[PDB]
Amino acid sequence: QNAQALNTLVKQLSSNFGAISSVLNDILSRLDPPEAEVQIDRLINGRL
């Protein structure tokens, strides 16, 4: 049970939760700040 819980927590990082991508660097190097901040906020909410 402990191993499976940790596995799920680790595997949760690959999701995008509706954002453009799951990599912060891609958002930084692809979009402008005013909406890159929105995508980052979406990712932050999901991970929290």
């Binding site: 596995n7 680790v10 595997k11 690959s14």
Partner: protein, 48 residues
């Protein structure tokens, strides 16, 4: 040209010029804790 872990994380990569396998280890990190008495006795601390 790439390896992955049981949790699908990058773990190896062939050098693009000289085809040799390079293991990848994440940079060292960890918590910092301090051992200290009641300040009513001394002011020395030890860092672990």
């Amino acid at each position: 040209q790439f390896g992955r872990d049981i949790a699908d994380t990058t773990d190896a990569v062939r050098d693009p010029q000289t085809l040799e396998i390079l293991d990848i280890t994440p940079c060292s990190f960890g918590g910092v804790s301090v051992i200290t008495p009641g300040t009513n006795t001394s002011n020395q601390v030890a860092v672990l």
